[PDB]
Amino acid sequence: PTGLPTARAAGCPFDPPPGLAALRDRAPLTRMEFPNGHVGWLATGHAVVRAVLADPRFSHRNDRRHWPLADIGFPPLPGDMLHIDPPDHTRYRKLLAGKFTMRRMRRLTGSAQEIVAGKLDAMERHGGPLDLLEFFARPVPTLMVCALLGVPLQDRATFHPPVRYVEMTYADMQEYFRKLVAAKRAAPADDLLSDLTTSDLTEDELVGLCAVMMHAGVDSTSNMLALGTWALLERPDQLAALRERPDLADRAVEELMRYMSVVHTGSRAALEDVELAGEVVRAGESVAFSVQAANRDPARFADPDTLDIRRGAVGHLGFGYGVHQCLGMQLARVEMRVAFPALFARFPALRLAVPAGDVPMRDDLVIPYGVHRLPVTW
Ligand code: HEM
Prior knowledge:
Blueprint: H1 19-26, E1 29-33, E2 39-43, H2 46-54, E3 58-59, H3 88-96, H4 102-105, H5 109-126, E4 130-131, H6 132-137, H7 139-149, H8 170-186, H9 192-196, H10 203-216, H11 219-233, H12 236-244, H13 249-260, E5 265-270, E6 274-276, E7 279-281, E8 286-290, H14 291-294, H15 329-346, E9 351-352, E10 375-377
Parallel strand pairs: 2-8
Antiparallel strand pairs: 1-2, 3-5, 4-10, 5-8, 6-7, 9-10
Helix pairs in contact: 5-7, 5-15, 7-10, 8-10, 11-13, 11-15, 13-15
The structure holds protoporphyrin IX containing FE.
Protoporphyrin IX containing FE (HEM) is lined by residues 53, 81-82, 93, 145, 148, 213, 216-217, 220-221, 224, 262-263, 266, 318-320, 324, 326-328, 331-332.
């Protein structure tokens, strides 16, 4: 019956569409008509979203689910583990999870510090005003994925717009990574891609995984760096707390993840009848889920609509949950824990360079949410 509430409020860039809260607080699982007319369900409560995301009976194949944000489904491509179901998905997870632990990703902390440092240096040389996305929020996570995969230093510039060029397609990236995989097979190094050349993945699977990673590790991270910097610079009291207690970086990253919920909406399809929140979701029905509503659920978080880095903690669903929990979440944490405090240590008076209403927001249906540019000065 209901449609998905998607309209953001004009003075409130960080908060969810107003209609979600009253829906969630009344019926955290409810019937929903999708943009294409499919009648499925909408999960907005934190517990019900977790139950959807943890249950392997829920498919993420694009030829099984209906998309909740557009009125529009093909089988998954090699390497696109987010849209592959068990048991193939389980093969990717068993191979990759142990390579993506915090203990392994913390070994890239120095790389993250130096990537961050280099982009801060180029910002100061240019001077304000400038676009934080072009100078910092997009190149930092791009160079981080390049470091993770061991992309040659002299090739990395092909993967992001020049800081002041052809934007690579998926096919362009597959061609590049086919060559790089062959090179690492012949001459291994201490990096993830070299390590994976000894696995059972086919060339097509490994090349697809790399091309996916260059988007999966970049788009959301970039928009988190932009939105999180904007939110922090409006809260000088929280910046003071982070300056005085730099150990608060870890909590601040979790609280920003919860508050921003940039991967705001998704869906899954039932592979068989599933009891969910007192209802039977029948085989073939899609359940849309709202990460952003779940991350503001008062059933789960005190004062959910207040941003307070001092109480930041794991438990939010900003990296997903369960079957397809974000593989890169520990790397994302390492890079954001470096980046947010470093930006304000170098530019303590960082602030917007335009009226807040002039910041160009992404359209309400785009995922991830974020901004197209973030003009800043200092
Ligand atoms: C702050 C930055 C990031 C956010 C907000 C984010 C968010 C997410 C979310 C919400 C999902 C699950 C989507 C769903 O359930 O439909 C996911 C999956 C995934 N992410 Fe991330 N991610 C980020 C960074 C990264 C990075 C840095 C990498 C790689 C280096 C990465 C790789 C992946 C992969 C491979 C999956 C699929 C995992 C699976 O299917 O088992 N992510 N991410």
